[PDB]
Amino acid sequence: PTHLSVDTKFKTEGLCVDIPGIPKDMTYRRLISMMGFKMNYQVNGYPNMFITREEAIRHVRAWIGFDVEGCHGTNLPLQLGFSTGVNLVAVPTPLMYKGLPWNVVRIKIVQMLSDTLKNLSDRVVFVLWAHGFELTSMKYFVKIGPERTCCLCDRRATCFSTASDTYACWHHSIGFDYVYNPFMIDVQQWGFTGNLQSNHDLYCQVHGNAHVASCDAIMTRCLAVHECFVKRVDWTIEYPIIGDELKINAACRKVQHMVVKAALLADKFPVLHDIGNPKAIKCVPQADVEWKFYDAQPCSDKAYKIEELFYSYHSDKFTDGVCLFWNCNVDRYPANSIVCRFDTRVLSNLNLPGCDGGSLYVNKHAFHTPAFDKSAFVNLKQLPFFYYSDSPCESHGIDYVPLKSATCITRCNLGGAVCRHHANEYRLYLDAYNMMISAGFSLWVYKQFDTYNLWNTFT
Ligand SMILES: CCN(CC)c1cc(C)nc2ncnn12
Ligand SMILES: CCN(CC)c1cc(C)nc2ncnn12
Ligand SMILES: [Zn+2]
Ligand SMILES: [Zn+2]
Ligand SMILES: [Zn+2]
C-alpha cells in the first residue's frame, strides 16, 4: 500500500448538510465521479485525487487549506477561501475580493498557488474539513489526467492552459487558467467529534473565526499540522532540499563551536551542562571542561518548563558552570546559559506556518517549534557577533582587500594588522553567521560574557 485506493470508504456525514440524501456507503471512486471527474482507469501516476495521511505528511510543503461557503438546481455565488488568507467570490452568471465569473477566478487561483508553492513543492495538497461545496466547486478550476511534465522545463505539470492547450509547473504557469492533477485530503475522515472550530480551538488560540472561508481554511490546515506534527512526531521522514539547508546547517555547527569555545576561554567554566538532543556530540572536543550530557527531544507542543528539566533531584547543582541549550526550547533559561533559539516568526521557504503561534521548520526533517517568546531570555543578553581564532597566521594557498574590524579576535589584530588567512576566515565566518541568523536562529548568552576577555588568551 503506497497510494490511497479509490475503493476505500469515505464517511459522508460531514457532507450531508450541503448534499442532502448522500449515501452513507460511498467510495473515493464514487465521490470523485460525483465531483464531476472521470478517471477512466488510468494508471499514469495519478491513481486518486485523494491521498493518505502518511503521503500528506511527506508533502506538508504543498498544504493549502481550502474552504468554500455558499453566499446565496439554480447555482448561487461561492466564497472560496485559502489558508494564504485569500477570499475570492465566484458568481455563476483577511483579503476578500468581489464576485467575478469562474473564467477569471480560475486565473487568480493558478497565480496564487503558483506564487505560494513554486519555491516549496512540486504539487498542491488541498487540506479540507469537507462539507460539500469545496468538493463540488473543484470542477470549475481543476483538470485531471495522466502525470505530465512542464512545457518549459522537466518539473511535473501542476497547471493547464485552455488558451494554448499546454502544461506547466508552478514556475512557468503565467496566464494559465486550470489547476492540473492537484491532491487533496479530508481532515474530517480522521475521526473527530464536533465541528472544525471546536477541534481547532482545543490546541490553538492564535487563529480566530472571523466567519469567513479563509478563516476556516487556515483553521483546517492548522488542525492538520497539530495532528501530524505536534501530537504525532516523525523524525525519520526525509524532505527534499529546496534552499540553503546544507549551508544553514554547516553555519549552525561552525557558530556553535565558535560561541561555545569562546565562552569556555573567557570564563573558564569547570563544567558544561549540555541539554538537548540525545544524539549530540561535544561541539568543542579539545576543551578542558567536564562535559555532561542531558537528553531532551525537540519539544513540538509547548516549550519545556525548566522546573521539570532541572529540578526533582547529573551534577544536580545546575547553578555550577554553564548550561548549553542548543535548540532546546525552555520557558525561562537560567542566567548561566548559552542559547540558540529558533525564531518561529521568520519568513522563509523552510519555515511553514504552524499551530498556536508555533511554526513548522522543514530542513531535512520537520520540526514543529513552539512560538518564540522574548520573556524566555530575561536572565540573558543578545550575543554580539564576534570571530575568534587561535590558529597560526599562515596563508597557504580569490583576491585581498585589507580587513579592519574590532570583532576579529586574533593575534594579528591584537598586533595591529589582520593577516590574509584570518581575514579570509573572518569573512567566511561572518557569512556563515549571517546565513544562520537570517534562517531564523537567535543567539543568547549569560550577561557577564565579554569578548575583551578573549585578548588575554594571546601572550
Ligand atoms: C442541487 C444540485 N446541485 C446544484 C446545481 C449540485 C449538486 C452536486 C452534488 N454537485 C454540484 N456541483 C454543482 N452543482 N451541484
Ligand atoms: C447545495 C448543493 N451544491 C453542491 C454541494 C451546490 C449548489 C449550488 C447552488 N451551487 C453549487 N456550486 C457547487 N456546488 N453547488
Ligand atoms: Zn516548468
Ligand atoms: Zn490555529
Ligand atoms: Zn592572523
UniProtKB/Swiss-Prot annotation:
Region (GpppA-binding): 355-369
Residues the record lists as binding S-adenosyl-L-methionine: D274, I275, G276, N277, P278, K279, A280
Residues bound to Mg(2+) 1: D67, E134
Chain sites annotated for binding Zn(2+) 16: C393, C412, C419, H422
Compartment annotation: Host cytoplasm; Host endoplasmic reticulum
Residues that coordinate or bind Zn(2+) 14: C150, C153, C169, H172
Reactions catalysed, as given in the entry: a 5'-end (5'-triphosphoguanosine)-ribonucleoside in mRNA + S-adenosyl-L-methionine = a 5'-end (N(7)-methyl 5'-triphosphoguanosine)-ribonucleoside in mRNA + S-adenosyl-L-homocysteine
UniProt activity-regulation remark: Inhibited by Remdesivir antiviral drug (GS-5734).
Protein residues bound to Zn(2+) 15: H200, C204, H207, C222
Its biological purpose: Plays a role in viral RNA synthesis through two distinct activities. The N7-guanine methyltransferase activity plays a role in the formation of the cap structure GpppA-RNA. The proofreading exoribonuclease reduces the sensitivity of the virus to RNA mutagens during replication. This activity acts on both ssRNA and dsRNA in a 3'-5' direction.
Subunit details: Interacts (via N-terminus) with DDX1. Interacts with nsp10.
Protein name as annotated: Guanine-N7 methyltransferase nsp14
Organism whose genome encodes this protein: Severe acute respiratory syndrome coronavirus 2 (2019-nCoV)
Gene name of the record: rep
